[PDB]
Amino acid sequence: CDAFVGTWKLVSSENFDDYMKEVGVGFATRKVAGMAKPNMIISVNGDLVTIRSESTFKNTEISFKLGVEFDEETVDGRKVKSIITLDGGALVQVQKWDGKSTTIKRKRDGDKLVVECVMKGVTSTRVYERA
Template sequence: MVEPFLGNWKLVSSENFENYMKELGVNSATRNTVGSAKVKIIISKDGDTVTIQTESIKSTVISFQLGIEFDETTADNRKVKGVITLDSGSMIHVQKWLGKETTIKRNIVDRKMVTVSFPNFVCASFFSVHMANTAS
């Protein structure tokens, strides 16, 4: 059920994000710029299609159907194969490229979206809901 994730989310805080970006190969100038950026995520749904729009220094938009692999270009310009699923109330986003893989796990906790990224460095980001979106 994707509905708890729908809405406009504003970044409140982030932990270990710079190390996560470093592990992904993001250069230091970009890491410094992105680390201080205000991030907004808009998650919406139209029928079976979910859209995640990330607004920051570089904005990205992905539209997908749960469980179906799609092509994605990340904010740091990696060309990846992505697949997003729901598991026990978590939205699990797996990205694969050049023999590498990263996972972004989103959960709703106390009306906040908590995003954890891994494998090698665990990074956590906390978003407050700006405006819930119940459209589906």
């Protein structure tokens, strides 16, 4: 997960609003949340990985052990159970809440960090470049 370490900047987003809507995010949040060009800061300390997202709207931060389920309060306000594992070079995150589930995969693609989100078939792709 050292290949993910660093600060990243959003450079392109595709279908993110559709994803949020499939997730159930409210109109206001979707608008403000989508307005953003958040920075993602990933760091590793021992077996604890931290993924931070910063923007003018809201900052988020989760610290976890890969493979151990934990509580996460998403940027849109959901309180979910997340599990993040390292598979094939990608960080695969699954969030579960109110009987629903969504997958967020973070992978390295060339010199970029690509975030793919999936909810009920609706998928969004966000590309980040080193800040």
